[PDB]
């Protein structure tokens, strides 16, 4: 296809801090990956972010009941949808699965959710910060995550190495030893 | 702490539109325009919550009426194609004769059109494959997950072939062993 | 619990 493509995008975003105690609502309209008009609950009205959206910002802000409706969106939309899915979104907990191999020894924790994780090493009684390389957090796209911590620190005479993983779904640290 | 995003788009002249809900980077559900059904990313979600899909179809109608207006507002200037980063991944430890799933991750591309194919030993492999909708990004490009289950072996190579108008030739990432 | 779509607004012409 020689044909040129034209893309419209709109995103209604709900930002939550300390649960539903502090909510911010954003109504965002995009054209060719370039926002042009936006409503912000902190601002309280539609505003053009580019000149391309100024006819919308003035037209929409003048509509009967528009402002009232958008000012109420933090309660009727964001807080509403937050509580509808709270059981399996904010409260989802899947514990990790750890395995340690060498290739340099690697500890890999998979199938965990949410994303916040802390994994540490111990060579052996004390954690050794040197020689650690972290893969970063990997999003599996199926509501699980991955991570490998590759460790360049050759163990020697019966050295017991333990990858310690700390996830919000468990009450005490998860420890496995090599 | 948490962000819920209702993300919609419409693409001309392919007449392609999409409606999904994002939670902290993971999709809660999308609406299948063709079947007019709500599609939960996890089947478990559908037993605890609901969504009337036809309200998503009404939005797609509006977005498209808007798009024509927005392209006319813009003197019919097209989108600049952007080629995708792709990455083939494994899911858990790889072990001989122990079933895993291959993951092909397509990132930072626009427009949201893509031909992706799984190649086993240079031959196309079509059965067992799963696929996600395009997922929104903060830079407003798109992401896509393709999954291929398999039993690992030594006499089997695997590739993920990606076609995107941003690329001059098809992009391909390899996985062996 | 049912989810709510925020409706898309028609642009100015």
């Amino acid at each position, epitope marked *: 296809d020689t044909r040129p493509r034209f893309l419209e995008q709109v995103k209604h975003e709900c930002h939550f801090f300390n649960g539903t105690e502090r909510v911010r609502f954003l109504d965002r309209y995009f054209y060719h990956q370039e926002e042009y008009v936006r409503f912000d609950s902190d601002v309280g009205e539609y505003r053009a972010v580019t000149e391309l959206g100024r006819p919308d910002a003035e*037209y929409w802000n*003048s*509509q*009967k*009941d*528009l402002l009232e*409706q958008k000012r*109420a969106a933090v*309660d*009727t939309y964001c807080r*509403h949808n937050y509580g509808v899915g709270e059981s399996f979104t904010v409260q989802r907990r899947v514990y990790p699965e750890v395995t340690v191999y060498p290739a340099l020894l690697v500890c890999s924790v998979n199938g965990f959710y949410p994303g916040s994780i802390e994994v540490r090493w111990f060579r052996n009684g004390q954690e050794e910060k040197t020689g650690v390389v972290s893969t970063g957090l990997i999003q599996n796209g199926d509501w699980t995550f991955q991570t490998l911590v590759m460790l360049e620190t050759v163990p020697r005479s019966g050295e017991v190495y333990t990858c310690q993983v700390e996830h919000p779904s468990l009450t005490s640290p998860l420890t496995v030893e090599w | 702490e948490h962000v819920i995003i209702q993300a919609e788009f419409y693409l001309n002249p392919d007449q392609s539109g999409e409606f999904m809900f994002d939670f902290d980077g993971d999709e809660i559900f999308h609406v299948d325009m063709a079947k007019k059904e709500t599609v939960w990313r996890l089947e478990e979600f559908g037993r605890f919550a*609901s*969504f*009337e899909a*036809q*309200g998503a179809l*009404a939005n797609i*109608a*509006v977005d498209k*009426a808007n798009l024509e207006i927005m392209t006319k507002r813009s003197n019919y200037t097209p989108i600049t194609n952007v080629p995708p980063e792709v990455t083939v991944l494994t899911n858990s430890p790889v072990e001989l004769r122990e079933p895993n799933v291959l993951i092909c991750f397509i990132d930072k591309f626009t427009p949201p059109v893509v031909n992706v194919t799984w190649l086993r030993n240079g031959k196309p492999v079509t059965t067992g494959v799963s696929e996600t909708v395009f997922l929104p990004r903060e830079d407003h490009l798109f992401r896509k997950f393709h999954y291929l289950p398999f039993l690992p072996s030594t006499e089997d190579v695997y590739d993920c072939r990606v076609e995107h108008w941003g690329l001059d030739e098809p992009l391909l990432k390899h996985w062996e062993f | *619990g*049912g*989810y*709510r779509a*925020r*409706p898309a*607004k*028609a642009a100015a012409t």
Partner: T-cell receptor
Amino acid sequence: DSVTQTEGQVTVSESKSLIINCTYSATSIAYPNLFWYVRYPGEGLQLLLKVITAGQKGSSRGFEATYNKETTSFHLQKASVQESDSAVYYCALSDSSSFSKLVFGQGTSLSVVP
Amino acid sequence: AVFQTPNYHVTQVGNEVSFNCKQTLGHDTMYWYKQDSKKLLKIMFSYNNKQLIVNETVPRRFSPQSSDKAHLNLRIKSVEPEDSAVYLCASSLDWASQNTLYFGAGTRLSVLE
């Protein structure tokens, strides 16, 4: 999805207090929105008041209505009706999760007698 | 405001009638409601941005039409005595159910044998 309210006409002397009963029994919708619409003689239908969150109270023109989460009701009350309150009052619900689509009660015609 | 037209109409069974409505609120969504002889108020149609989004199983007789966001027209191809009613046009900011509906004065249709 049904709304039932006071059927027929109610006659009330001015300065007396008024209750218009309204209960909703909609098997198939979670979190409804509740409305009171009013039609003054020779006029068109217009909103009296609405409540869009489960526990709150809406007020207008001296009228009051509480969205009850236990009695599944939206009773309309006024402490001292005035003669200009003579009208037809409509109780209505809508599904907050779907398209706006009002299910109306049968309507109560109020005649405030001086 | 919500203007509808005509105010009164009388016609024999089998004829065609057309009702027209207009709202000046800048709203996206318009409606047809039917007010039958017995003080009842049931929704017939709902249009959003010229697209039909709600149809409460109305007989094929009725054909709403909207070439513009602000206009909603109703046409009844060949009327039956059951069609005698008051038809109310309304408008709402969008199709969200929290939105207030604003109603017109109504069209009073009387269909006679």
